[PDB]
């Protein structure tokens, strides 16, 4: 029976770290990431931003980031002029890039598939473009970009993401206002980035989620939103992004919990099934992953929530306004909606737990047998 409880722990470790659809742990990690991505999708469009490379006022700089959830648009336009970036002001281009890099990694990797928690070496390619226009816009220039000839230049660097080496290609292309194809009859510069080999693992995407929500909180720019004529309303319609203190806290807390959940994965790996220690460490780990998963579910669950934050979840974050679109998907109508499968993931997380009851008792059983043995 000591050995039956070990086959049981082996079996349930596999259900937790090898499986996905039916892993509480997996769904909890997904829910934390999607909640973060969903947050930006909801408010990104309402956020002001502009300035030059050094976060100063610019009087002419318009900088546009593609595959971003903007107002009636697949780009976010950072074109606020004459006031310097800062707290309760426009987000700076420095910050917006940090946020945009993270957003692009998350949407591409979610699009591709988060692997199971044990699967830890997977990678993904991420490509993303932004433009600069306006005399005085240094946001696409050598200084900010690394590329010698702004006019067609291309640099290949290595950078490190989650302690892994990522080969980055940057290229720069000016499109003259006279150019055949340029309808916006304004000169602009287009910067493409390709990140070859980005980590696509539960852990890494959680760091990206972390950087996303925490670049927002810290930069704390001004926003103003527009309500739809029907359906849930957001009031007040104007303020500072870090003023969403409850949403941000909960999202922070689910990322932390999911991170704590990933650490328990190695304890399990380090003790596949005197040995009593390992049995205990493995069993306790499994119990902790289930405790943290239920907790991630409870945090964002509409039945535990109340006015205002409840409203933000049920009416905005857990929805998609895209027209009727897989996980990574940005349209002219993503804005003011999460479009990150938050309704569905909350569901699946709570269901994987419903269907994890026998495993919860087998894990609990082995906990005692193991603890007993240890003493």
């Amino acid at each position, epitope marked *: 029976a000591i050995n039956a409880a070990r086959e049981n722990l082996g079996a349930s470790a596999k259900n937790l770290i090898g499986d996905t659809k039916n892993s509480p742990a997996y769904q909890a990690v997904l829910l934390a990431i999607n909640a973060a991505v969903g947050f930006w999708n909801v408010l990104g469009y309402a956020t002001q931003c502009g300035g030059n490379a050094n976060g100063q006022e610019s009087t002419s700089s318009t900088t546009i980031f593609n595959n971003e959830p903007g107002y009636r648009s697949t780009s976010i336009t950072c074109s606020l*002029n004459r006031y310097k970036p800062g707290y309760y002001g426009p987000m700076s281009i420095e910050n917006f890039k940090k946020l945009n890099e993270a957003y692009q990694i998350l949407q591409t990797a979610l699009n591709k598939g988060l692997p199971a928690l044990k699967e830890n070496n997977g990678t993904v390619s991420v490509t993303y473009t932004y433009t600069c226009s306006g005399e005085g816009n240094d946001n696409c220039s050598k200084k900010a970009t690394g590329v010698s000839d702004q006019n067609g230049g291309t640099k290949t660097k290595t950078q490190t993401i989650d302690g892994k080496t990522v080969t980055t290609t940057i290229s720069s292309k000016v499109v003259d206002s006279q150019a055949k194809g340029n309808t916006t009859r304004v000169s602009y510069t287009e910067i493409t980035n390709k990140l070859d080999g980005v980590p696509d693992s539960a852990q890494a995407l959680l760091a990206q989620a972390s950087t996303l929500i925490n670049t927002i909180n810290t930069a704390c720019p001004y926003f*103003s939103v527009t309500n739809k004529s029907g359906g849930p309303q957001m009031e007040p319609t104007r303020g500072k992004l870090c003023g969403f203190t409850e949403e941000i806290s909960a999202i922070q807390k689910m990322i932390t919990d999911a991170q704590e959940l990933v650490n328990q994965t190695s304890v399990i790996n380090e003790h596949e099934q005197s040995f009593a220690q390992g049995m205990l460490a493995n069993a306790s780990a499994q119990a902790k992953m289930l405790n943290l998963a239920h907790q991630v579910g409870q945090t964002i669950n509409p039945d535990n929530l109340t006015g205002t934050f409840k409203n933000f979840v049920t009416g905005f974050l857990a929805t998609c306004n895209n027209k009727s679109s897989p996980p990574g998907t940005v349209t002219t109508q993503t804005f003011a909606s999460g479009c990150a499968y938050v309704e569905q993931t909350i569901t699946n997380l709570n269901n994987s737990i419903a269907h994890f009851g026998t495993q919860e008792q087998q894990i609990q059983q082995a906990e005692n047998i193991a603890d007993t043995l240890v003493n």
Partner: nanobody
Amino acid sequence: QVQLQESGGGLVQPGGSLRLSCAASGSIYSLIAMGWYRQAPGKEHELVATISSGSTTYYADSVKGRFTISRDNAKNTLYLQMNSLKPEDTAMYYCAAYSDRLTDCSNCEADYWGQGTQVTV
């Protein structure tokens, strides 16, 4: 978040007229007012005229009487009819707008701007 693009600038005779245009796009819901600045190569920039969501207009003494501000809400377009032009009107005219961040501030300057269009009289 808002983008503004002017047109209609050109060469004009003293006495004549021009209508300037501005196509606005983006977060138009967030604007509390729109308007026109100008700057001559030598001079300071000058606020020419404004129009504030109630259809309430301001004009600089210097253009008051000669120039009309006006919008077409349906096509998201801002106009500036300029009559009886004098050579002292030669300048870059900029389309501009004020976001709702500027609500309580009466003398803040517009936080969105076009790339300007040239009017030489």
